[PDB]
Amino acid sequence: RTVLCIDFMVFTVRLLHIFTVNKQLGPKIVIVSKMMKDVFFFLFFLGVWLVAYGVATEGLLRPRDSDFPSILRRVFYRPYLQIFGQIPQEDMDVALMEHSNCSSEPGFWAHPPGAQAGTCVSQYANWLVVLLLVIFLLVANILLVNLLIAMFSYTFGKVQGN
Amino acid sequence: RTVLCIDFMVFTVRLLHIFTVNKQLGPKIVIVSKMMKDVFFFLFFLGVWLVAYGVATEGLLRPRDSDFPSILRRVFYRPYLQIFGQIPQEDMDVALMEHSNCSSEPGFWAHPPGAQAGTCVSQYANWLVVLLLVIFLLVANILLVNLLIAMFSYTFGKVQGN
Numbered sequence: 001r002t003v004l005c006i007d008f009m010v011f012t013v014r015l016l017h018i019f020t021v022n023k024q025l026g027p028k029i030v031i032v033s034k035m036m037k038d039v040f041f042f043l044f045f046l047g048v049w050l051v052a053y054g055v056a057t058e059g060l061l062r063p064r065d066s067d068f069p070s071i072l073r074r075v076f077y078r079p080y081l082q083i084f085g086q087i088p089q090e091d092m093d094v095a096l097m098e099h100s101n102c103s104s105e106p107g108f109w110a111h112p113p114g115a116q117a118g119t120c121v122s123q124y125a126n127w128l129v130v131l132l133l134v135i136f137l138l139v140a141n142i143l144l145v146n147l148l149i150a151m152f153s154y155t156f157g158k159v160q161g162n
Numbered sequence: 163r164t165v166l167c168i169d170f171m172v173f174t175v176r177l178l179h180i181f182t183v184n185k186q187l188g189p190k191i192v193i194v195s196k197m198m199k200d201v202f203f204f205l206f207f208l209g210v211w212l213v214a215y216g217v218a219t220e221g222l223l224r225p226r227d228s229d230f231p232s233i234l235r236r237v238f239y240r241p242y243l244q245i246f247g248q249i250p251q252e253d254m255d256v257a258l259m260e261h262s263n264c265s266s267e268p269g270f271w272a273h274p275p276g277a278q279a280g281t282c283v284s285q286y287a288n289w290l291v292v293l294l295l296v297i298f299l300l301v302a303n304i305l306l307v308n309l310l311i312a313m314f315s316y317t318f319g320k321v322q323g324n
Contacts, residue, residue, distance in 0.1 A: 041187045045178070052174035059167040085247035095235075096277050125164045130239065137246055142307070143201065147194060150314040154322065 027160065034159045038151040045144060053136045054079045060129050061092070063118020064103060073116055082133075083140050091117035092133060094126040189322065196321045200313040207306060215298045216241045222291050223254070225280020226265060235278055244295075245302050253279035254295060256288040 019025045054075035063074070078088065090096050090113055097110035100120070108123040181187045216237035225236070240250065252258050252275055259272035262282070270285040 037186045038190075041181070041190050044181055044187075048174060048177045052171040055174070056167045056171045059170065060164065087243065087246065087248055089243075089248075128164060128168075134239075134242065137242075138205075141246055142204075142310070143197075146307075146311045146314045147197065147318075149311055150318040151190065153315050154318055 031156055031160055034155055035152055038148060038155060041151070042144060042148045046140070049136075049140060049144070050076055050079050053132060053140075057092070057129055057132055060125055060132075061118065061121040063112075063121050065116075065118045070116060070118070074118075079136065079140075082136065087133075087137075088114060088117065090114065092129055094121065094123045094129075097121075099123075193318055193322055196317055197314055200310060200317060203313070204306060204310045208302070211298075211302060211306070212238055212241050215294060215302075219254070219291055219294055222287055222294075223280065223283040225274075225283050227278075227280045232278060232280070236280075241298065241302075244298065249295075249299075250276060250279065252276065254291055256283065256285045256291075259283075261285075 016029065020029050057079075058071065058074050063070075078091075092112075094110045097112050099108070099110050101109065102111060102120040103109040103122075109120040110123055111120050112118060178191065182191050219241075220233065220236050225232075240253075254274075256272045259274050261270070261272050263271065264273060264282040265271040265284075271282040272285055273282050274280060
């Protein structure tokens, strides 16, 4: 069933051939195929930045539910969703959490209400977590996307004639 | 631990050197380094606008929890997050709050359910707070970002050859 569910996407992608017959949108489909270089440049930069930011934030927070799937989720999936307006402040900012001594280790800890956000996180450098979130929003949500738009426009204008 | 968490980002940034060897994306990385002027222009304009809007809104609302970290948060952090779809209407619009006489000072006050949004805010010119929010969304979410995209495209087309 899973293989067939993916195969449905593979089959439905074939419908793009219909609009290669139009005189106006025929050039567009063949221009689009030239944008993969820009797409992969964006993907490489995004992967590097996501690795850096996610690992730094996960190291700063030190959640107790440090299972490997949870580590990968909080490193990659959550910062990726932060690019699309899904910013879980209650799972990162300690001023919005409840302060409790759940952890046996010395220090101060707080309980995030998220299901996969860890049982408790540390309060030592939460202002730095907030600053890292600010810089992540500045770079990923603005610099990379605007740069990709610029590269798309440049490639379109360069390759439309051919 | 905090220093090492930042150092991990510093180290991971070095992976960008890998794609300076590609014949197609090699020019892209050196074009990107020319965009810092546009980035800093955007940052200066954004800082000026955030200062103005945040201080005006904080002065209009007059929350009772006027601690200095809270003042800085409600002036800078919240309006910055409003650029990325995080608009806390329940903390700014008085029509969505509960009306109670918590404040001893004369006037009308309401209790925002936000944790760091102040104990109670004033109801005098809330329509002006809403109008300021409208103008902030018009300027920051549209004018500045579209202008930055235009500047990025212009610089890309100007400096690709060199």
